[PDB]
Amino acid sequence: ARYLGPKLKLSRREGTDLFLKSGVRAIDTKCKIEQAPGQHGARKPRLSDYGVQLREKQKVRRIYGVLERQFRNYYKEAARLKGNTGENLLALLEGRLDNVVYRMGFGATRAEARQLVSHKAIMVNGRVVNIASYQVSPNDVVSIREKAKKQSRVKAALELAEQREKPTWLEVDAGKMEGTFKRKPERSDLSADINEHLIVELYSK
Amino acid sequence: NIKSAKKRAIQSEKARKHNASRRSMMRTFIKKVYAAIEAGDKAAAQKAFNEMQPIVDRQAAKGLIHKNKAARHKANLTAQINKLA
Amino acid sequence: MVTIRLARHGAKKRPFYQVVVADSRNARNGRFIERVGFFNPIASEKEEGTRLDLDRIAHWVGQGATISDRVAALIKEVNK
RNA sequence: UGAAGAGUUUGAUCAUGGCUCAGAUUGAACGCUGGCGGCAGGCCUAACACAUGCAAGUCGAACGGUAACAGGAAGAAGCUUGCUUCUUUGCUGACGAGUGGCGGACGGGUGAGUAAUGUCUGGGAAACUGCCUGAUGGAGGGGGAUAACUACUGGAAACGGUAGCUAAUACCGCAUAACGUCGCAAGACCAAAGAGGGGGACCUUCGGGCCUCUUGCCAUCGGAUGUGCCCAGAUGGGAUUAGCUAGUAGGUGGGGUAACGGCUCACCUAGGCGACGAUCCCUAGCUGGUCUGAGAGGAUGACCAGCCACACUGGAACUGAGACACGGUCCAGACUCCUACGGGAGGCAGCAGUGGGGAAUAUUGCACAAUGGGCGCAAGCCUGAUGCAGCCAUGCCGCGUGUAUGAAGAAGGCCUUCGGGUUGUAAAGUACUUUCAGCGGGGAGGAAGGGAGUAAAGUUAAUACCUUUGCUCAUUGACGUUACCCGCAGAAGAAGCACCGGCUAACUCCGUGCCAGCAGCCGCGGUAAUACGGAGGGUGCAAGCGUUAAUCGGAAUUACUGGGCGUAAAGCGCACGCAGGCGGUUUGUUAAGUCAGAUGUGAAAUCCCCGGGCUCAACCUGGGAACUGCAUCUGAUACUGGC
């Protein structure tokens, strides 16, 4: 599965930044957010309650690029040990290797981080990885292989990571290009705009 | 093929030619005491049992009745002769 | 009639090899009377891959059960 | 200490309800579109069907034997003078056929039968019980047969029939006589097979008597593991199924069996069962469990665990601990298959390919190497068991089809009271970089022993074997692009499918014009149709996408949890009344039920939590926690039953 439209089309339909098609421009340019809103939303719809709901569900999915069958599985795993689906769901998305390889700055987007794993450019605990849909735990070590360290897209992704807030869940060193996971993330320490009010009530009425 | 039915289902006839001739000979001596329990005087049935037992237990050491049947032929028959004097 | 034998386990291509006391009747892997060890082929590259209860085995073969010559050769691997 | 709702009767409003839908189940098809892996599975459909090839062997340490191999032995040659060669000989290692024993009632397959001693579960009495393992006695001597091999015959023939020879641990007498037979008891009665090794006195061409060892034989009785029987509980439809037995209902004596029983022959009687649902037809094997849900309940059993039944279809006996015995015996019939046209042989519901059915389901592959089981006191063999190779958009899972940068935003299309917008950072180009494919380079572990040398009271006759241990010889792989990991030039071969008024989001402009074709429902459609078709776009999913029979949830819409009966759906027109069911208050007492306590059970899996190991995860595995249940033996008697 892929998205074959312009990646900023999503952010331009949302009127909000989704961290898509990122590189050495970092933010806002030429994202045209609320400057090129397109053919819908200007003029933001009222519509059904089934809007937020679906268009709010897509906004918590597409920001991690996650497919519906994955998202339902993370809703199952977030419904474990009374941890709350409004909270412990974030740990299953933010703790995923295609977000970790992005947070470490090896990719400029979660797509570009996922690509680097599908191109076998990444290691986890000294072994090569090809699966990007995988959970990372404390004391797990993630690094880029010498055969891929010189790709211009990684060069740009590390310069963009310096323009991004540092995570309190994992560490990374720019000289070894190696980072280690430290603690699983928390709502009031992630401190950003992501939903709660819908991820507390999915797949039920 | 080339299986044991030859010495089994087909040569059990050579055993029939021996077991059956013992079983009838034996059953005659049983019937010669199972009639004698109508008395008078226990000695007739006692003598006929003492003529039965030697030819019954002759089939009870190998083959025909060598496992359970030989005493089965005597058990309740004793309880049919001890009712006399 | 009862043998101290191997049970493959692990279905297709991923054997686990347990050593069990079992009748010549019924099952070929499960349905066993008593387990007496294991012969695990993928043991984390450690010597923890072989276990044998030599006391219970001696009582099973003493009392009249068959011990396999394959297992008799493996008694040497647990020392001894 | 536990949980999806909305739409819709009308001129409309409020209740209530039929229906449609959410998410699974999947042991699938369609039919477009199809870049590749990883794991699993492979006829729920006619007990319908087939060519050819397979699927059950094995022991000479039970035995008469000796074609073949090599030794030993006795001779003969080359002279090679220490071996090679030849003949002769079962002495020995051994072995082709046969006699004999063990196994082939297993591992499997299928689901026709069956609403049932068939299944699931706990007990019992009159019981056996090959295999495994024990004790206490016995352990001498004869004989009749029959295959191999031959004679002949129906032969077209696999052959197997009619006759002959001969041997045994096969088959039958004699000798011996309790732990046993039956009982409280005297007492009568009968079997066996030895076999293979090892060795000391004295001597030999070893031609050892005799003792000792291992492992067998007979009886009698135990241990164990199983099994036949008897008891008590779960186990379709139909009550417009009302009749059902009759070895039935209750007794008696033998015979049969390990043993209950009308098992089985006789003889002694005439009942027995049922509306509180007997009984018979239709359909159907059952269960660990799986699927669904918050659960109850409902559905369902392939695949992974466990029984039964069944072997062309029907039927009969033997063998045995167990079978009307898939690859055995004996018959009948059908249909294939063959024919020398005189009659002959076959069992796909073991495994392969396949005929046929159905919407529909893997190759006439390689190998006995590993491992289970089978023989043999064992090396060694058998195996369509098993272990491997090959197949799939059938499922479950996973990945790819390139990234950067590139305008008030081109040329074109599509929308636009012509301002602009939109396809679209997309492209054109400009800078870089490759997953899988392909082609190459490295490479685990699966495999371990037996024969022997050696050597100990373990055993014995304290220098074999056997028992046992180290080293040293001997020395086993069908599978190999094995598992796993790394590279090479190159964007290299790679995206489709459904949907767009209301519910339920995405649509503007046209085409058609009540026509043509959609759905879950109203319906959409007559010249400005969001639903049909087309253009340009949008929305969702993606090597798929849509679509559905079949099972649950939602369905409190059968209410056990959990409902209603004045009128929506319902008190059945009204009085009496047996069984059934119900029953005030209190002192005793029974202790079935209940709860308590204890001893057993709820297997392996699996749901849940946390590990290990194979791309993630599944899975396969390791430990916890569960499986709120069930069987019994004691206690208490509040309360239901009982006195």
For residue A81, say whether its CB is under 7 Å from any atom of strand D: yes
Type of residue at B5? A
**Both structure tokens of A137:** 């735990």
DSSP letter assigned to residue A81: T
Q: What are the C-alpha distances in Å from B22 to residues A96, A126, B27, B28, B47? A: 90, 88, 9, 10, 21
What does the alpha-carbon distance between residue C61 and residue C46 come to, in Å, rounded to a whole number? 30
B39, B33 contact by CB (below 8 A) = no
**Both structure tokens of A184:** 């699983």
What does the alpha-carbon distance between residue A121 and residue C54 come to, in Å, rounded to a whole number? 51
D chain positions with any atom within 7 Å of a protein CB: 3-6, 22, 39-41, 98-101, 103-104, 106-108, 129-134, 160, 171-173, 177, 180-183, 185, 188-192, 219, 223, 225-226, 254-259, 305-307, 317-319, 325, 327-330, 371-374, 386-388, 397-407, 409, 421-426, 432-436, 445-446, 448-449, 469-470, 485-487, 495, 503-507, 537-543, 603-604, 608-610, 612-616, 619-622
**Both structure tokens of A151:** 């790709």
- What was the experiment behind these coordinates? cryo-EM
The separation, in Å, between residue B17 CA and nucleotide D255 C1' comes to: 22
DSSP string covering chain B: ---TTIIIIITHHHHHHHHHHHHHHHHHHHHHHHTGGG-SSTHHHHHHHHHHHHHHGGGSSSSTTTTTHHHHHHHHHHHHHTT--
What does the alpha-carbon distance between residue C47 and residue B5 come to, in Å, rounded to a whole number? 55
Q: How many CB atoms lie within 10 A of CB A149?
A: 13
B65: CB partners within 8 A, 6+ apart: B56, B59, B73
C12, C79 contact by CB (below 8 A) = no
**Torsion C25-C30-C36-C39 (CA) sign:** positive
**Both structure tokens of B51:** 């003529």
Rg for chain A, CA atoms, rounded: 17
What domains does chain A contain, in order, with CATH numbers?
A: 7-93+190-204 (1.10.1050.10), 94-180 (3.10.290.10)
